[PDB]
């Protein structure tokens, strides 16, 4: 009885706490886990990994989909094959997977808006560095923007720019933003590499902490920048929760412990649709517990 | 004697039975006891007292559906301050310090209704909504339905949203008057079970019994009968077994400190929200909901 976790950019640190929750639930439940993922950020490689998982016919699969649409046919394949499968971290809303466990990215952006307004005393100019073509980053940016337009009319969003998931690139972008906008007070990076490059731009310009910076996730570089007073806050996603509750949900499904709802098609919906695994604000106040 | 309490209002109504089934199912597996208590009427002060008494009992946890999103917050926070795990299910209290909420996402339930209406109408036509204008859960369904129509389905216009008052007879009068006022009306969404019954009955009394598409809410027998009799096109069922089972499971995790919480220096031990799902029920699956 083995439950499989499937990722992308599989060696990345973000997954380590996902996996830990997953192994904590499995230890609790006396079952086995196997970790897998595409080593690169490559859709066809994640399709191969998932296809390979389905072929071993495990007790269940938890997967963070690299793309909300281009993995769907493979996900439904698992479902069709009678394998319990849940999404975690990144979803595929049109697929037939049995649950999604992860961040409400709109609300995450809303959390960042309130934190920003607090750091700026309710006024000032802000910018976003994000990934304009990724849906989770788009929701993050819309949550932030819409929350500020709604609750903080004295804070104004003056740019949303593309940090390309790349620190050097985000630094050049941040730097250009600091030139173009004399009174820029705050920067929200929706993506970790973006925040690191925004922190390097502010510290290379001797402006730590004149410029308020909010970033995402808890990579060591992000936490070092926060511990050093450069990045003001980072949003930590509930990765342990994703792992612990995905496993749990897979186990329940596998052992038929739920009373499924019955669809028009007479197929079964044995799980809740969505588990919001939370978001934590990390500042120097709490940075220590996140290493 | 490890005991989990489920607290409701109008506690004897059929809505709750499947929540309690779910709760009891989780307890049985875990070898723990449950108690079911509630305001027997629709009465705010009554539920407050029921919850104060539960707190006094010092259970291993409390799951409660809050009769009012505001008026129960101070009592809920008393449970929290007393060190008793407490989760909301079904009807929330967003401003309280409760540990989690397990329940429908009403905006999304409205959106699901919109997609199914769109499909029923081949994406075009006049529709009306019958709702509770001053209730937040009903505002959310109406909004989710309208904004999904606005954005995704330009050729479907909702021509009216009407107050059904939770009373069918009134909703009958309303559907009838709607049918007179809008000759080309193709559909009606009722966000509330009694509106849906009133709409159903008006439609059959006018022998429109399949040229007006009707979507309702919940799985009251009155509703499911109209679905089976081809009068109601679909009804939206909440994941009430889910609510009870995962509430119990979450309280048990809280009570025993079974999670790794996120810090701030105070711990956040549970996922904030569990979306327990909405299922579209037509004559195709209606049999499984009795």
UniProtKB/TrEMBL annotation, chain B:
GO cellular component terms, A-Z: cell envelope
Gene Ontology terms for molecular function: carbohydrate binding
Protein name: Sugar ABC transporter (Sugar-binding protein)
Record lineage: Bacteria, Bacillati, Bacillota, Bacilli, Bacillales
Record keywords: Signal
PANTHER family tied to this protein: D-ALLOSE-BINDING PERIPLASMIC PROTEIN-RELATED
Keyword Signal: yes
Domain of life of the organism encoding this protein: Bacteria
Family label: Belongs to the bacterial solute-binding protein 2 family.
Database matches in InterPro entries: Peripla_BP_I, SBP_2_dom
CDD domains, A to Z: PBP1_ABC_sugar_binding-like
Domain Periplasmic binding protein residue range list: 9-252
Organism from which the protein derives: Halalkalibacterium halodurans (strain ATCC BAA-125 / DSM 18197 / FERM 7344 / JCM 9153 / C-125)
Compartments where found: Cell envelope
UniProt keyword Signal, yes or no: yes
């Amino acid at each position: 009885e083995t439950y499989m976790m499937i990722t992308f950019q599989s060696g990345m640190d973000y997954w380590k706490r996902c996996l830990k929750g997953f192994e904590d639930a499995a230890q609790a439940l006396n079952v086995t886990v196997e970790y897998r993922g595409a080593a690169q950020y490559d859709i066809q490689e994640q399709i191969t990994v998932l296809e390979q998982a389905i072929a071993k016919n495990p007790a269940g699969i938890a997967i963070s989909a690299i793309d909300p649409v281009e993995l769907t046919d493979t996900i439904n394949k698992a479902v069709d094959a009678g394998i319990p499968i849940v999404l975690f971290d990144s979803g595929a809303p049109d697929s037939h997977a049995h649950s999604f466990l992860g961040t409400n990215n709109y609300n995450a952006g809303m959390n960042a808006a309130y934190k920003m307004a607090e750091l700026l005393d309710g006024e000032g100019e802000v910018a976003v560095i994000t990934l304009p073509n990724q849906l989770n980053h788009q929701e993050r940016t819309t949550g932030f923007k819409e929350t500020l337009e709604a609750e903080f009319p004295a804070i104004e969003v003056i740019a949303v720019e593309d940090g390309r998931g790349d620190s050097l690139h985000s630094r050049r972008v941040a730097h250009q933003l600091l030139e173009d906008y004399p009174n820029l007070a705050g920067i929200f990076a929706t993506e970790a590499n973006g925040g690191v490059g925004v922190g390097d731009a502010v510290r290379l310009e001797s402006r730590a902490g004149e410029i308020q910076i909010i970033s995402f996730d808890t990579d060591k570089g992000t936490l070092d920048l926060v511990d050093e007073g450069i990045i003001s806050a980072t949003l930590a996603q509930g990765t342990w929760n994703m792992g612990y509750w995905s496993l749990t949900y897979l186990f329940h499904l596998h052992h038929g412990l739920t009373e499924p709802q019955i669809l028009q098609t007479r197929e079964e919906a044995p799980l809740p649709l969505y588990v919001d695994t939370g978001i934590t604000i990390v500042t120097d106040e709490n940075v220590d517990y996140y290493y």
